[PDB]
Amino acid sequence: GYTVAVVGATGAVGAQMIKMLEESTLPIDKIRYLASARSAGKSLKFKDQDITIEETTETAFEGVDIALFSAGSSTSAKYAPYAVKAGVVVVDNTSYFRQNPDVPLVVPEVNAHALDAHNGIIACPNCSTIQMMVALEPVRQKWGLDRIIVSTYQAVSGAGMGAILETQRELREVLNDGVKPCDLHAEILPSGGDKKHYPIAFNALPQIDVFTDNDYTYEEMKMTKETKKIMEDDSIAVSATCVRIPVLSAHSESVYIETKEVAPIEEVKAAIAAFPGAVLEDDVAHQIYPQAINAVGSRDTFVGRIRKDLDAEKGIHMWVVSDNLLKGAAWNSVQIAETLHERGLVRPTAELKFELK
């Protein structure tokens, strides 16, 4: 069996990493939980066993086979190269290594083949990208993809545990104390690293991550660049608007595509239904469609509202929902780890390709 390290075990994703590993088929001989210095000493469960949390350092990875990183891009930049040097295979949830050409950016249902040539780090894509890839791959396979326009409806748990708590307390202040939403005090949202913070209670914040130089945010540009890498097709036009709404968990997306050939809607529904990881929830006569509150706790990605554009021959609209901490993060990572096991790819990398910092 393996020694498996969860780096960021105390966070929003880390908690779900623990659950997914507890429910995994991966043969685990030893589990280790790693976090920051201030979490060291604390205990946390793996099944009915008590695990002491350890501080993440350059020397903490000796004897580890697989490390699942979910501790911020900075922690991955600092320690993942040391893990690879120690002979670990890292599965990283952060954005840091995603666009490195020596690093496979993987959704196992779409591009598992990319794992074969890994150099010790596999990147899990952005949550909003993953669920879109699960919904759209079956369509691309049969009719191609020319362009995507997406508007997202993203849950606050995507911003971490602190963002969940900020949201709940803001809502309680409005509903229980009568505070006007626009008078609320925020510390984290829309983006913890940015200069200004805004209330999310009864709001829709059209900013996720910080702004890039082309006036799209990094979140929107991640959807663009990650789609092209995962689908290994730079000709797919992708533009996004990424919005935070007062949902605790599960992202929703209004997705517009134009295919290369006309894709009959009943066939599109059937292709999506048949694709692993995608569930068709589409029966408008009975008001059936994906909903965030229904998707929470499921590894599946739910697709509905599927209909042709009113004017564009090859245009199709749909609605895509998935749990951002599961398929969007911890489940995608555990799936990758299971696939690495299945393919005999859990072993040390001889050549180190990532700079030690």
Ligand X SMILES: NC(=O)c1ccc[n+]([C@@H]2O[C@H](COP(=O)([O-])OP(=O)(O)OC[C@H]3O[C@@H](n4cnc5c(N)ncnc54)[C@H](OP(=O)(O)O)[C@@H]3O)[C@@H](O)[C@H]2O)c1
Q: Which residues are part of a known binding site for substrate?
A: 154, 244
In this structure, are residues 45 and 31 in contact, taking their beta carbons and an 8 Å threshold?
no
Binding region for a copy of itself (CB under 8 A) out of 4-12, 125-133, 198-206, 340-348: 198-206
Q: Site map for a copy of itself, 145-184, x if CB under 8 A?
A: --x-x-x-x--------------x--xx--xx----xx--
Per-residue 3-state assignment (H helix, E strand, C coil) for the chain: CEEEEEECCCCHHHHHHHHHHHCCCCCEEEEEEEECCCCCCCEEEECCEEEEEEECCCCCCCCCCEEEECCCHHHHHHHHHHHHHCCCEEEECCCCCCCCCCCCECCHHHHHHHHHHCCCEEECCCHHHHHHHHHHHHHHHHHCCCEEEEEEEECHHHHCHHHHHHHHHHHHHHHHHCCCHHHCCCCCCCCCCCCCCCCCCCCCECCCCCECCCCCEHHHHHHHHHHHHHCCCCCCEEEEECCECCCCCCEEEEEEEECCCCCCHHHHHHHHHCCCCEEECCEHHHCECCCHHHHCCCCCEEEEEEEECCCCCCEEEEEEEECCCHHHHHHHHHHHHHHHHHCCCCCCCCCCCCCCC
- Shortest Cβ 18–ligand X spacing (Å): 11
Q: Site map for a copy of itself, 20-59, x if CB under 8 A?
A: ----------------------------------------
Closer CB to a copy of itself, 59 or 176, in the complex: 176
Closer CB to a copy of itself, 87 or 160, in the complex: 160
Q: How far apart are CA 199 and CA 127, in angstroms?
A: 23
Is position 356 an interface residue for a copy of itself (rule: CB under 8 A)?
A: no
Binding region for a copy of itself (CB under 8 A) out of 63-71, 133-141, 237-245, 342-350: 237-245
Is position 84 an interface residue for a copy of itself (rule: CB under 8 A)?
A: no
Q: Which of residues 201-220 bind a copy of itself (CB under 8 A)?
A: 201-207, 211, 214-216
Binding region for a copy of itself (CB under 8 A) out of 50-58, 129-137, 313-321, 327-335: 313-321
Residues forming the site for ligand X (CB under 6 A): 8-14, 35-36, 38-39, 56, 70-73, 75, 93-94, 126-127, 157-158, 160-162, 324-325, 328-329
Residue 124 catalytic? no
Q: How far apart are CA 330 and CA 299, in angstroms?
A: 9
Binding residue ranges:
10-13, 36, 38-39, 70, 93, 98, 125, 127, 154, 157-158, 161-162, 244, 324
Which listed option, ligand X, a copy of itself, none, makes contact with residue 305 (CB within 5 to 8 Å by class)?
Answer: a copy of itself
* Catalytic residue of the set 118, 124, 127, 242: 127
* Catalytic residue of the set 118, 124, 242, 251: 251
- Residue partners of 299: CB distance under 8 A and separation at least 6: 277, 323, 326, 327, 331
Residue 251 catalytic? yes
Q: Which residues bind a copy of itself (CB under 8 A)?
A: 147, 149, 151, 153, 168, 171-172, 175-176, 181-182, 190, 194-196, 198-199, 201-207, 211, 214-216, 224, 237-239, 241, 243, 245-249, 252, 254, 256, 284-287, 289-294, 296, 304-307, 309-312, 315, 317, 319, 321
The residues assigned a catalytic role are 127, 251
